Amino acid sequence: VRMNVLADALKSINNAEKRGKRQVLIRPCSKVIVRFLTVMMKHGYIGEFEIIDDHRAGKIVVNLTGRLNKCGVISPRFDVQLKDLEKWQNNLLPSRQFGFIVLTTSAGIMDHEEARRKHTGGKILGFFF
Template sequence: MRHDPLNDIINSIKSASRTGNRTIEAEPAARLIGRVLKVMQDYNYLRSFEVVDESKGGKFKIVLSDTINNCGVIKPRFPVKNSLLEKYEARYLPAQDFGILILTTTKGVMSHIEARKQGLGGRLLAYVY
């Protein structure tokens, strides 16, 4: 029984990048997870990903790039105002302007950089650097 599919996929990505594997298949192919992977791809942490619809729930086929040092899921999913993003950036990222926080906002899933530009807050989902 899965309690947190996002955590499972992020941990699969972290394990694959540490062992040198460049492709992984992870399930389930949920929309939220797809949007998180799209943000990671936009910042060149993933080369590509696609949905492989073989069974109930489907799978993602993910091709990693060489730029992931660490990634993880943020729990509990803190609600964050735009003015407090810098506090969580200092907590989860090793340096300023190095890596991204991924959060869900009223405008969709985006990085903390985009959320700050748009003046949005939201709930923290994950970090990547």
């Protein structure tokens, strides 16, 4: 069956971006998907998206600015400490100049740079560059 709806969302975005499409339909939606999309959008990787409100579970239409090289999930959500963040971001990111690791944190869902700014660790949700 379907576990990790965030994995499905990120893989659908990845495949739509590879196909060159300007919009992708993501279903089901969830809070974690919305926060991940907001993290991706604050860095200009996707652009505005819309939540279609069914009465069962969300749908999302994400507009796709052709900037996303790759958005992926890390399963399982390994717990990550601050001292171990550099190793994760050296394994997952193409450069030290761009690309973000998303972590769920007691302070919210946010990228690794802002996690460093808040001096906090968490669980790795995924990455995008």
